[model samples]
Target: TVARDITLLECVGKGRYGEVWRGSWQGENVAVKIFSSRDEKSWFRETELYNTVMLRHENILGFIASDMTSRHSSTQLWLITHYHEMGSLYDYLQLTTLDTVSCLRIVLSIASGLAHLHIEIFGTQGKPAIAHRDLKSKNILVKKNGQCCIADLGLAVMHSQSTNQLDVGNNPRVGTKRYMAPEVLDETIQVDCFDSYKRVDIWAFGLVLWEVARRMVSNGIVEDYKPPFYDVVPNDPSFEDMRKVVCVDQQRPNIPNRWFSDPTLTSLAKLMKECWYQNPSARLTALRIKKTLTKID
Candidate 1:
């Protein structure tokens, strides 16, 4: 079979590895991410997952094509995904503040995206049983309906197979330091498999909720959204630092007493605190978060 051809139009994003380009294939709109010299190997991991799973969720970017060909300078691998020009959540957040309705909508969309990844569904037999190891604002994409989807599955894990343990143990400290859980930073985490790591994702989701809540204004209160461990300077806080801040310090994100005066902020503040509990076991599940968000309106 002949491989389909794609054409690149504009550069959308760039990183240490390569640039993400807006492109088209056979008249279908797509976004093509081309890896550079250093990240050639990294792109392979993403390809492996997408090809294995195909497209599963409305919230996830749809995979369109993967092309590999010989070139004069080096090998070029093209990964094509459905075009979403709205860009990442990271860039979007910088541009606007969220009102109560928008804030709740944004978080609910994210929770729905995550719950789809975590829970088993009918007919699909088992769930994708996946975890987004790097869950941050940067990797989330805002869709046309104003819903947010989890993108960049390069670090995703499928939990059904036992042989997959090696990747978890060997995974480099790849997530953004600000969003990492205390156990992840401490190496106390059992990386031998995917379950523990998924829990860590839940912890990170809690922080994302905190971020969303901080931006929410009620009764004339407006405060910046700060994630857990925001006070830890030095850029990359170590496991020991996280342990002290999250465990021993027994400190969690504060609701800013002013926020407590508003009914919305007060309820959300209590929910987020449950997320940051020192005992990981006590942290709210992704399903619970989704349900909680549903009730917020």
Candidate 2:
């Protein structure tokens, strides 16, 4: 790969991980993130995974390249990837509602991506199972074709059953409290077992399913875009706030009347609920979710 000059056009997103810029390289649009100095450690794992795993998938965010340069006596770290003008799934949902087919396409693509992460391929050049510690709508980007790709690999965990290895990297960043699984919030999660981490992601996957489902059109109208448990939790809810709702109260997002307007959402509610069992082991695997979503199609 050759290094070249890029013309940064505008800032597309900004969060605790710094900002992503929409830029042009060789006249082709690309997304770039400039890492903060304190976050060098977190971003390091992402770069290593891209190089070693050679992750090429339609649903996972495309990895183009990375560059580090010294500027003004300080260093700047960069990650560049394909630019999707539609922006994040969160932003996309805010603007428009989804028909049944569009909603299925969006969620199934995410299911396929999550399945690819959880299942290891066995071959000379293969992939290890991975767990996305921080999965959320904002961490997903919408493509012009109406599907989404998962992003933010800094907190990903890697595992290989054959080698019995698990690489749980040390990153200071924590998961979004509202999306965190009950086991995670209660600290009952078993860190050493890869399956535990995988199940944890399943829990969050169920929550994301709820987030997306609410936007599906039923009566030629859709509910306002809201995060999971938005009505129950405070703004920027705390860890303790999540713990009580998920673990103590054992509550899930309410099933609205519209979902029962038809069987499409009825099946979906059943499938997503499979991912939310209080016992992590009881939660469905990513492959099972992919299968159920496929039938929903």
Candidate 3:
């Protein structure tokens, strides 16, 4: 039985689904993601996925409980999870600079989480391979330990090799346009192939790496926080806008010359470049990324 002891204390974040609150659940702090009636499907999908599997992992957001409450005349959906006081990586990066160890820890933890999600394990009850369709700085939360956790799996897709079935989910959600891969922007990604989805994730992961690397202090030079393609595109770019820049011009985010001066930053720049390949098959798998990151120290 799921506990309903959650009591919303304050609104911490907001998105299309609804407001996220820092709530109290049995005297412990928890994050309560409340969904509007219009976005009930996203809540349902996320809750279903969490319930269908024992998905606990160190780098993945900890799911507590999901509950439905009747307020006034309407039904309200609430998803309770562990609350990270540091908030999103996007917000944290704006005010913080990272050293080599801290930067590697953040990105490595993220890669580990992605690898866990992408690899399937067989058993009496098997876990399916999952791809995070929407991966960005905002979707990653910063923990107090300077590590990161991947969150916001509403747009994730799952594939079961044993059953030869793909559960693309029934949500009408699309990923952030700025993080779209080249093939995704060009409408050329093989929708029928599971690897195509993973490639798309890798493309976004590269942008995330770029985001973290820019904030890493090297030779006393640190760049300000900026979203991917901030210099090339307008705010809220259209589909054609991204397609033209990513497909027509084949442009990727710029790497500052200072990055070449730092060994760690240089290696990261090269890895990120590989993730931006125009061909979906050319990108590194999540497991490969994890292994590479583990050896960086």
Report the number of clashing residue pairs per model: 0, 0, 0
Candidate No. with top lDDT: 3
For residues 1-297, what per-residue lDDT tens digits would candidate 1 score against the true structure? 012477677898997657788877788778887777665655677788777654467777777767775655766777778888788776666665777778878888888888877664544544456777778777788776777888777667666553333343234437766677767766677767566667877877877777777777777667654545677645567656666776666666666787777777777777777777656678887888889988976
Residue 297, candidate 1: Cα error in Å is 2.1
* Local error of candidate 1 at residue 149 (angstroms): 0.4
Residues 1-297, model 3: lDDT tens digits: 333567778998887668789988778899988887667877888888898966788899999988888756877788889999889999999999999999999999999999988889788556889998989998799999988999877778888897878888877667889999988888998888898899999999999999999999999999999999999999888888999999999999999999998999998998999899999898999999999998885
Worst 10 residues of 3 by lDDT: 1-10
Candidate 2 Cα misplacement greater than 4 A, ranges: 1-4, 71-73
Candidate 2 per-residue lDDT over residues 52-105, each given as its tens digit:
895789999999888886655777778888999999888889998898999999
Error of 3 at 222 (Å): 0.5
My TM-score estimates for the predictions, one after another, are 0.83, 0.96, 0.96
Over all chains combined, what TM-score does candidate 2 have?
0.96
- lDDT score, candidate 3: 0.89
Model 3, residue 213: displacement in angstroms?
A: 0.6
Query: What local lDDT does model 3 show for residue 183?
Result: 87
Model 3 ranges off by over 4 Å:
1-4
What are the lDDT figures for the candidates, one per model?
Answer: 0.71, 0.87, 0.89
